[PDB]
Design a protein around this ligand. Structure first.
Ligand SMILES: Cc1ccc(O)c(C(=O)O)c1
Length: 167
């Protein structure tokens, strides 16, 4: 049993809810929250900007030190950093950004990072301002992630479309 409430079960391991991932993290304090990161861990907008704002910029301060030591992530890659006030850990995952011309085939590699964690609270990778089709992102999630993933979809209209269209 876990603390996640009000999710619709899509598969054996994938759950979905219309929720603000920031508000959801604050309530649940999950072991792992996933950030929709970029390779520079520059948390300006979308999920990264909202998560980072909720940490009072501590996520950005930690991230800048990580990049100064390690250099940029790979598209499709990840790193584990603090979850600050939102979670034990934040798994920063880089999905391909279609609005920068990145190979959408890298979305499966991105979701494979989730399999290193038994339970996660996550957004749909490469959705929102990363420009991918969220229906596609949910299909790759279901077909790639084998651990237990709780998906927070920000947009109510999109949430209803994802559920209604799910195969
Ligand atoms: C907080 C937040 C901001 C932008 C977004 O696109 C999402 C999401 O896709 O789930 C969430």
């Amino acid at each position: 049993v876990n603390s996640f409430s009000g999710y619709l079960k899509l598969t054996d391991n994938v759950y979905i809810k219309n929720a603000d991932i920031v508000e959801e993290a604050k309530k649940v304090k999950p072991t792992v929250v996933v950030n929709a990161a970029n390779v520079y861990l520059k948390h300006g907008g979308g999920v990264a900007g909202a998560l980072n704002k909720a940490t009072n910029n501590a996520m950005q301060v930690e991230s800048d030190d990580y990049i100064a030591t390690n250099g940029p992530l790979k598209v499709g890659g990840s790193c584990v950093l603090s979850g600050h006030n939102l979670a034990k850990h934040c798994l920063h995952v880089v999905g391909p950004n279609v609005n920068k011309g990145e190979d959408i085939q890298l979305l499966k590699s991105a979701y494979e990072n989730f399999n290193q964690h038994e339970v996660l609270l996550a957004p749909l990778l490469s959705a929102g301002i990363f420009g991918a089709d969220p229906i596609h992102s949910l299909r790759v999630c279901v077909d790639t992630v084998r651990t237990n993933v709780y998906l927070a979809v920000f947009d109510k209209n999109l949430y209803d479309k994802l559920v209604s269209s799910f195969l």
